Design a protein around this motif. Structure first.
Motif, short mmCIF file in Angstrom:
data_model
loop_
_atom_site.label_atom_id
_atom_site.label_comp_id
_atom_site.label_asym_id
_atom_site.label_seq_id
_atom_site.Cartn_x
_atom_site.Cartn_y
_atom_site.Cartn_z
N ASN A 107 8.31 -9.22 -5.59
CA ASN A 107 6.84 -9.30 -5.58
C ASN A 107 6.31 -9.38 -4.15
O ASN A 107 6.71 -10.26 -3.38
CB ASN A 107 6.37 -10.51 -6.39
N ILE A 108 5.40 -8.46 -3.79
CA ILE A 108 4.76 -8.44 -2.47
C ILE A 108 3.25 -8.51 -2.61
O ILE A 108 2.64 -7.68 -3.28
CB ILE A 108 5.16 -7.18 -1.69
N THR A 109 2.65 -9.51 -1.97
CA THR A 109 1.20 -9.69 -2.01
C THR A 109 0.61 -9.79 -0.61
O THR A 109 -0.58 -9.57 -0.42
CB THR A 109 0.83 -10.94 -2.83
N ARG A 110 1.46 -10.14 0.36
CA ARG A 110 1.04 -10.28 1.75
C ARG A 110 2.08 -9.68 2.68
O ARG A 110 3.27 -9.61 2.34
CB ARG A 110 0.86 -11.75 2.11
N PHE A 111 1.66 -9.28 3.88
CA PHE A 111 2.60 -8.80 4.87
C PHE A 111 2.13 -9.07 6.29
O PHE A 111 0.94 -9.31 6.53
CB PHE A 111 2.85 -7.30 4.70
N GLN A 112 3.05 -9.02 7.24
CA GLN A 112 2.72 -9.23 8.65
C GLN A 112 3.51 -8.30 9.56
O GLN A 112 4.64 -7.92 9.26
CB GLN A 112 2.98 -10.69 9.03
#
Ligand SMILES: *[C@@H]1O[C@H](CO)[C@@H](O)[C@H](O)[C@H]1NC(C)=O
Ligand SMILES: *[C@@H]1O[C@H](CO)[C@@H](O)[C@H](O)[C@H]1NC(C)=O
Ligand SMILES: *[C@@H]1O[C@H](CO)[C@@H](O)[C@H](O)[C@H]1NC(C)=O
Ligand SMILES: *[C@@H]1O[C@H](CO)[C@@H](O)[C@H](O)[C@H]1NC(C)=O
Ligand SMILES: *[C@@H]1O[C@H](CO)[C@@H](O)[C@H](O)[C@H]1NC(C)=O
Ligand SMILES: *[C@@H]1O[C@H](CO)[C@@H](O)[C@H](O)[C@H]1NC(C)=O
Ligand SMILES: *[C@@H]1O[C@H](CO)[C@@H](O)[C@H](O)[C@H]1NC(C)=O
Ligand SMILES: *[C@@H]1O[C@H](CO)[C@@H](O)[C@H](O)[C@H]1NC(C)=O
Ligand SMILES: *[C@@H]1O[C@H](CO)[C@@H](O)[C@H](O)[C@H]1NC(C)=O
Ligand SMILES: *[C@@H]1O[C@H](CO)[C@@H](O)[C@H](O)[C@H]1NC(C)=O
Ligand SMILES: *[C@@H]1O[C@H](CO)[C@@H](O)[C@H](O)[C@H]1NC(C)=O
Lengths: 529, 75, 78
Positions: C35-40
């Motif tokens: 699950n991916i909801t944010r990234f940097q």
């Protein structure tokens, strides 16, 4: 010896009156102009029904035997015409090695110059007999002409027939699925018939539902090229799961502290282990040893440890004991395989190998796949140990004593348990996908890395991009594929098909016809392209 | 074959004592634990030993212990 | 499946994005189930977001994409 069936073997297919009509029907019939065996007296096959005919002067042939074993083991059908009435019986008859007539039963019924014809077929347990008796003037052949056989007997027996024998010259033919056009007259009888599969002209007559065809060109059926073998190809295996790091390891963990290795993102070949025949135990739960290789999983867990030979039985679902309860517990709904082998010449030492330990004491039993590597002193009594071994206090672990001279129950065994699970994940752990060679310029079935279909595979002159696997036409159909092992581009051309038309001058001019195969290479079917 | 015969008796003592660890309480539980330990201690002591007389001494004591444990198992 | 597409081209431009058309090719496909909801971003760069859209893609003789129409951009494109 064989003869020409001509147009023999036609019978009234049902009990329906029809007049001045051409009726098309499909049933088991004797094909026109077939090869009929001429006998002058072995046991013959029955197949799907048999056509029997005989020529006579003095009533030599008396009857028939139908059945399977025909040796007082099973029931058989005996039909004999003795002097007056025909006697039909179904019993567990004992027959001679060469039965003839001189000069437990479930069913009983009582009813050259001479040509007698019969049709014997068994449909859904009903043994149906059709017959015809006509005068002839013919010694060494069958007469050429048309007649139909009428139903005479219908026996609701429910008996299996695979072989039969004639009881005392006669002819034997066999029935098969055929389509016929039958011509009925004003008197309700059948006066003619067309075998729709005999030739292009007969086929045309059936297509048009008429015994007369005028001048013109008519379409009948279709021509189609059929595929032969199936070409299945997959990408190179490339890698394999590190099972050699589990089974061929130089060091194994103690049973109280079993070592779990996670295997994932690799090709899992289970055939190598299965057929090694180097294991004393190979027991699979939830999966078959010969099907496992074709299953995909999210994770494979390899739990390795050393125990005594006698303790091997505890490594299973629903088990109890020192190992099952305090060291290595499996669930009752366990899915996976338990593999073990003798390591007496590896892990044993002279004087005893005491480097292996197991848990002897524990307050409670372990949960499935739970481990406990604590060295806390066990309290056996009511008096507190305070971390000190002594009276009513024991060190939780105890050592093994493995030596070369131990009995097999006390010899060391290396145990590997392969536990399987599948989650919401893609499931990347699958066994090897076997492939075959490539066949080109022929009509084949195929499967290219999951892309199935049929057609002729040829070398293309096309360009696919480095990341493309197959192409499509404007119709969104596949017209080309990439070979997964060779990286070549192939074109797919559908196997030839088209209508077939028969050209005729009309049946009042000639029975000669020409056949046209539409939109096809003559090389695939005087030949005029 | 004598060593295996003795190991068999010791196995019977340990296995019964093991079951008793989930059945007995108080002093009787403590005793089963003691005998459980003893049986496994003898397994190793037997391996690291010689002289039939010492082997037989283990056999006899182990048999006496097995019979003793059965008095608890039946309770 | 975490799917990564990419393209690397030469430019001569300091303070903007170039105007022109190119298509990005698939490079990586990771069967993770994460699950991916944010990234940097780890060290200038630009960030946009994807949404359901209908496109008409023009393929050339060499199998590549040379143009595209955004069917929801305006009445003419539609
Ligand atoms: C059928 O009989 C003919 C003779 O009329 C013979 O030439 C032909 O080979 C036979 N066919 C078979 C399959 O026996
Ligand atoms: C024919 O055989 C049956 C026995 O199957 C017998 O009862 C009958 O009388 C025989 N017929 C004649 C004319 O003898
Ligand atoms: C007699 O035949 C019947 C056939 O319906 C069979 O079921 C039965 O078992 C047979 N009797 C004996 C003793 O085999
Ligand atoms: C014939 O044998 C088959 C088994 O091969 C069985 O299924 C079938 O029902 C049998 N038919 C009759 C009429 O006994
Ligand atoms: C049989 O057909 C003929 C004509 O071919 C006809 O004259 C005769 O009457 C028919 N038989 C009967 C009983 O009607
Ligand atoms: C372990 O080694 C043997 C001997 O080379 C080999 O036959 C076997 O396949 C190996 N097992 C694994 C899992 O590699
Ligand atoms: C597969 O292996 C063969 C050798 O057996 C090699 O020639 C071929 O190039 C390999 N293909 C791929 C995609 O690695
Ligand atoms: C065949 O054609 C001739 C005319 O040449 C005609 O007299 C005859 O009746 C025709 N036969 C049939 C069955 O039509
Ligand atoms: C028939 O096959 C030959 C040889 O491949 C080819 O030259 C010819 O054009 C084909 N005929 C048709 C109508 O395609
Ligand atoms: C992401 O979280 C949701 C719960 O909000 C869950 O239903 C879904 O299966 C998760 N997806 C993955 C790949 O973990
Ligand atoms: C790419 O397209 C050009 C025409 O624009 C063509 O000449 C060239 O041959 C194509 N590339 C390849 C490998 O065919």
């Amino acid at each position: 010896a064989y003869t020409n069936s001509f147009t023999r073997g036609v019978y009234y297919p049902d009990k329906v009156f029809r007049s001045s009509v051409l009726h098309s029907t499909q049933d088991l019939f004797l094909p026109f102009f077939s090869n009929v065996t001429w006998f002058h007296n072995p046991v013959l096959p029955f197949n799907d029904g048999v056509y029997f005919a005989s020529t006579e002067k003095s009533n030599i042939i008396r009857g028939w035997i139908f059945g399977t074993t025909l040796d007082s083991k099973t029931q058989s059908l005996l039909i004999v015409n003795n002097a007056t009435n025909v006697v039909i019986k179904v019993c567990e008859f004992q027959f001679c090695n060469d039965p003839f007539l001189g000069v437990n039963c479930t069913f009983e019924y009582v009813s050259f110059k001479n040509l007698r014809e019969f049709v014997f077929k068994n449909i859904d347990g009903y043994f149906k007999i059709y017959s015809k008796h006509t005068p002839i003037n013919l010694v060494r052949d069958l007469p050429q002409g048309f007649s139909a056989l009428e139903p005479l007997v219908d026996l609701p027996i429910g008996i299996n027939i695979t072989r039969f024998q004639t009881l005392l010259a006669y002819y034997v033919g066999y029935l098969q699925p055929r389509t016929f056009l039958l011509k009925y007259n004003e008197n309700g009888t059948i006066t003619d018939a067309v075998d729709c599969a005999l030739d292009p002209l007969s086929e045309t007559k059936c297509t048009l539902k008429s015994f007369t065809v005028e001048k013109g060109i008519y379409q009948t059926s279709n021509f189609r090229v059929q595929p032969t073998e199936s070409i299945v190809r997959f990408p190179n295996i490339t890698n394999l799961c590190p099972f050699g790091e589990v089974f061929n390891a130089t060091r194994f963990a103690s049973v109280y502290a079993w070592n779990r290795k996670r295997i994932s993102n690799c090709v899992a070949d289970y055939s190598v282990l299965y057929n090694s025949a180097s294991f004393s135990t190979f027991k699979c739960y939830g999966v078959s040893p010969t099907k496992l290789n074709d299953l995909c999983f999210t994770n494979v867990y390899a739990d390795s440890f050393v125990i005594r030979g006698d303790e091997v039985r505890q490594i299973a679902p629903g088990q109890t004991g020192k190992i099952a309860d305090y060291n290595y517990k499996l669930p009752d709904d366990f899915t996976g395989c338990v593999i073990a082998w003798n390591s007496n010449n590896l892990d044993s030492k002279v004087g005893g190998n005491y480097n292996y330990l197991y848990r002897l004491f524990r307050k409670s039993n372990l949960k499935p796949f739970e481990r406990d590597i604590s060295t806390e002193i066990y309290q056996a009594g009511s008096t507190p140990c305070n971390g000190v071994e002594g009276f009513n206090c024991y060190f939780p672990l105890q050592s093994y004593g493995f030596q070369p001279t131990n009995g097999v129950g006390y010899q060391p065994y290396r145990v590997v348990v392969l536990s399987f699970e599948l989650l919401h994940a893609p499931a990347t752990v699958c066994g090897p996908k076997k492939s075959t060679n490539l066949v080109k310029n022929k009509c084949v079935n195929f499967n290219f890395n999951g892309l199935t279909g049929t057609g002729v595979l040829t070398e293309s002159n096309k360009k696919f991009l480095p990341f493309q696997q197959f192409g499509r036409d404007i119709a969104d159909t596949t017209d080309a594929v990439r070979d997964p092992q060779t990286l070549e581009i192939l074109d797919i051309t559908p196997c030839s098909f088209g209508g077939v038309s028969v050209i005729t001058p009309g049946t009042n001019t000639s029975n000669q016809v020409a056949v046209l195969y539409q939109d096809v290479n003559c090389t695939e079917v005087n030949v005029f392209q | 074959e004598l060593e295996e015969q003795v190991m068999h008796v010791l196995d019977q003592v340990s296995e019964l004592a093991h079951e008793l660890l989930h059945k007995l309480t108080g002093e009787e539980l403590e005793r089963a634990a003691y005998f459980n330990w003893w049986a496994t201690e003898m397994m190793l002591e037997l391996i690291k030993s010689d002289d039939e007389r010492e082997i037989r001494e283990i056999e006899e004591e182990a048999r006496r212990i097995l019979e003793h444990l059965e008095e608890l198992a039946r309770k």
